[PDB]
């Protein structure tokens, strides 16, 4: 039951975040004024990890530096970090092959794709996995699933329809549809290979992706054997179902509580909002995980760190978090928005449902609505932004600018409009 | 003939005066009853939406329907067995769920109407005029009164508001909705929920259906919710001859809390809910229900978990009892919004003698 | 406002008993008792005064005689024989004919019935939820092949797919517009319809305007789907049928299920 | 008869999608519209022709559709006087009458 190794699939979903991920690594970016890797690490610790393995390729030096700086580098940790360095740009099949070539895989190894933070206890899950394994010899891997918000409507990228069994908890069909975003394909297919064996057919759609996998020693060998499987969800699970190796079982764990993986921008925002509220049961910033953190809890879901300065007569709405070393002026209306560490806010600024990253200067008499500002990118005087406007690294938005809905700004100093240099595109300036 | 005896769970030592038992699933009855009354009774017994205001209206509607359907026998006159029928209906209602003050008033009105027209007139001319009259009455003393109350409230509300609300009182819902839509002020609504009936939840849902900024709380969580917040509104059932607030469950405690934390409470009431019956405690006459309401373990109404509890009769010496109607203190509420615009609760029966 | 229908006919599917002109399917001694006794008992339990019974061109007085002799009810029954039915349509054509006699909501119950479940609670359910059509399903024997398809949705209890496997297409056939709405659907294989039907007022107008009904099962309840385009105007709640599951033994007789009922009885 | 082409169709339903039908039209020497018409006649469907691929309303399969195809290849392709492989389509005035390439005979194409 004890002694389990962890392999984390990092630097995999780059360019998916279309403005960012060009200069700095994907996972190093802060969720709520603190890096996303840390949460994942914490989760792993909670689960039960004895050795840490990270897959790095895109900007690996920085990752290494971070690791060196991190708390787990010191001898007190039960798990040590040793990174896998590989050639640039490859699929999860190739990575698996590489891993196999090296050879550290023992027993029930943990494979996590992307970064996930959830509240559910993992020991019970592990026990379940063990018991099910003990049933039959040819058992493969575990999948994590959670109940969705009644009806699906904000899910277009990954609205997977899971046909599941109640007695065994096993997947029957996997399908992706772009139906709510673009009405072109509205169709559901059922394969007749497993109709006269299951009987209890429950067709469901409202389930959210987690992408946390508890995997047996069979998986890397399988990957080595069948080199056609580049992905792990679309081709692999389906292959398993359609009997590639005959007489084999897979798991689909069902939980009533919240569990969602990071995937896009709106989804990320939603996750952040959830974190701000009391959705996750023990996961709160006021406990202080990174040890340098000095967060404290206040009334009406408001987070305040130490050395946070806010001026008199400023009406605040609901759910606000402020990072350390902030100086905020007078006459501000703040509603459902997070302010980063050491940020300098001017005077008379109306904010609603927005997001502000580490070290950003917000200019006097500006309105920010449902838009994101990345690290070291500054806003000037009189800037009016609309819903879902992503701003990249070190973008200097100077005096007087207006940007419409869903305008994306580049991060690296290419194809998308508005650049890192002085003034965003209303008058042509840049490289 | 009906059904008698056989009651679930323990009878308890304290609070034994009113009916708490009865027909839930129908078996053998008199073959003359109009089914609409039965259906209504079935609804009322297992209702989660109604709260003082709409029940009476529903009853009135039912009565109107009955009148419309009513046919005079060839032998006997219009009023001979009609009274008996009415009595039977009343008995059925009581068996299902005890009669309210509004219902009593309605009954009285009906009786008066019956007395007014003596058996001499033909069928199709009398009831044509009766139903119209009743409709007119309904239009007058209910809807118009409600509208008036709403308008009074409109002028009474100032600038920058933060309100804590409770109940499934329709008038309050109307008020809040009005605030949200047609006034366009800076209104914040905080909702309190209760265990016997999910009224708070319903209110929240209604608010959502409009698009209002909603905080959601309970009876326990009150010490932290204040720490900016000013107004407190409650829904009344009936005001007695004493002046005390004879209303639903979790109101009195809230009022007390409000009193403690500086800012007073405002309650709304109609100009027909007033009673001549004298009582100063909840022990006198109380709406008591079956302990089936306090079985579900949090979250939602339909869940059914096999946790720790699920027995009442087999348990030796165990009393699981809950109350629905309460008597709140007189001095704690300051504002009363009735048919005569504004007034104090200490007036008691100023409208009762006025009729 | 309240009325009940009793459907009577003649056997054609069964192997043996029915060939004689004197003895019809309405009066059969299964175990020293008439088959229609149960229905009468049910009706008595339900408490209703106005009940109209429909009969085909064959046997005009025998049924009446049966009703009269032996049998408790003590109600006023009315029996009619229209001369348009040719057996090849069963009751739909009767329904189409008789319309001015209907005042309100009506209960449909054929002669072929075996019941043990509580009676009034179906009626009450029909009254409460306020829907157009209601049907019931009961499991096949567990004590020691393809049959017919059913689908169930529960959180409200509704029916989605009820098409039989007589002229069955080899792969599964549904609709995604009916699947995207209501995302959760459970496939039933064991359940069978037991001829229990409840209907409302808003059905009388549609029968005269557009006749489409077949076998009282194929297209009696099947036109309900308001998806994709919608061209036919509704008469003035969405047009949806309901389905409820039961545990106790109460079943239908049509095919090779006549000798099993006797076995069930004698224990 | 070996003239029956393999139908490459996935059972992703709601609307019957036949992308391989062009090949069928080609091999059997047929206009695509006639097949569609036949299908319509067989079962109550409504759709439109698209250049190669079909959008036909209904969740139709690859076995009952296959059966239909087989049927259309036993009373709408085969001859009588002489059983031959090559049969071409000609619009001959409104009702369809096809001709055989081997001999040249007018056959009834309606049932």
Apparent shape of chain A: globular
DSSP strand content of chain C: 15-25%
Number of helices of chain A: 8
Supply the number of helical segments of chain C.
Answer: 7
Portion of residues within helices of chain C? 10-25%
Round the Cα radius of gyration of chain A to an integer and report it. Answer: 23 Å
Number of strands of chain C: 11
GO molecular function, one term (chain A): translation initiation factor activity
Protein name (chain A): Translation initiation factor eIF2B subunit epsilon
Keywords (chain A): Cytoplasm, Initiation factor, Phosphoprotein, Protein biosynthesis, Translation regulation
GO biological process, one term (chain A): regulation of translational initiation
Outline the structure in words.
The structure is cut from a larger assembly and holds chains A (431 residues), B (355 residues), C (267 residues) and D (111 residues). In chain A, 17% of the residues lie in helices and 23% in strands. Chain A is an alpha/beta fold and 431 residues long. Chain A has a domain at 5-276: Spore Coat Polysaccharide Biosynthesis Protein SpsA, Chain A, CATH 3.90.550.10. In chain A, the strands form eight sheets. In chain A, strands 3-2-1-4-9-5-10 form a seven-stranded mixed sheet, with helices on both faces. The radius of gyration of chain A is 23 Å and the shape is globular. Chain C has one domain. Chain C has helices at residues 37-46, 62-68, 92-97, 120-129, 177-180, 204-209, 259-265; strands spanning 2-7, 51-54, 77-80, 105-110, 133-139, 150-153, 158-159, 185-188, 191-193, 197-199, 241-246. Chain C is globular and about 55 Å long. Chain D is 23% helix and 20% strand. Chain D has helices spanning 21-27, 32-42, 64-71, and strands spanning 15-18, 47-50, 53-57, 87-88, 97-100, 106-108. In chain D, strand 5 (97-100) and strand 6 form a beta hairpin. Chains in contact: A-B, A-C, A-D, B-C, C-D. At the A-C interface, strand 8 of A face helix 5 and strand 8 of C. Strand 8 of chain A pairs antiparallel with strand 8 (185-188) of chain C. The PDB classes it as translation. Keywords: integrated stress response, ISR, translation, initiation factors, eIF2B, tRNAi, GEF, heat domain, eIF2 alpha. The entry is titled "Structure of eIF2B-eIF2 (phosphorylated at Ser51) complex (model C)".
